Design a protein around this ligand. Structure first.
Ligand code: FE
Length: 186
């Protein structure tokens, strides 16, 4: 039974219920994420920005089955074109807007990766991707407004691939946490 999360802490409690088992009801998880109305005071502790690139701030380690983190995107900060390592990936905007560009998996032949579509993700919206849907790039294209997003990955993963848009070639990268549970982790 899916109720509206009243606070971020309430959302986290609900997520622990939704991931108590071995499978994932994507539509339910996305609906509850969308229904939490971002309250900046509740997540300020995790919103630790870096001047030069976006940061990943761990909020909850889940039950072994999922990670929940907040990503903080300065003006003009963006990601690589990335996969998600055979995991579910949910992305909910907490502040600002992000552009999501979708790409197909490359062919073996070296070729430019042409976007299949793009969309603007707006405050409180929750998007979803997995490797069967494709690859994506996420960007804060704003010149004036930082963005903050809430990400849930299941299972957790700390490596993925970045893809060279000019060739489709991939390289494994390890993802690091800028902070964990509100504590900066250099
Ligand atoms: Fe992603």
């Amino acid at each position: 039974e899916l109720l509206k999360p009243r606070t971020l802490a309430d959302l986290i409690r609900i997520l622990h219920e939704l991931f108590a088992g071995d499978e994932v009801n994507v539509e339910e998880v996305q609906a509850v994420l969308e229904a939490y109305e971002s309250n900046p005071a509740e997540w300020a502790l995790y919103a630790k920005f870096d001047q030069y690139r976006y940061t990943r701030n761990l909020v909850d380690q889940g039950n072994g089955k999922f990670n929940l983190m907040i990503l903080c995107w300065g003006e003009g900060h963006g990601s690589s074109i990335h996969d998600h390592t055979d995991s579910h990936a949910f992305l909910k905007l907490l502040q600002g807007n992000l552009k999501e560009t979708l790409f197909d998996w490359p062919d073996k032949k070296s070729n430019e990766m042409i976007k299949k579509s793009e969309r603007t993700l707006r405050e409180n919206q929750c998007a979803y991707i997995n490797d069967s849907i494709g690859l994506h790039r996420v960007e804060n294209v704003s010149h004036t407004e930082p963005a903050v997003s809430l990400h849930l990955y299941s299972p957790p993963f700390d490596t993925c691939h970045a893809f060279d848009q000019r060739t489709g070639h991939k390289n494994k990268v390890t993802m690091t946490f800028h902070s964990k549970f509100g504590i900066r982790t250099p």
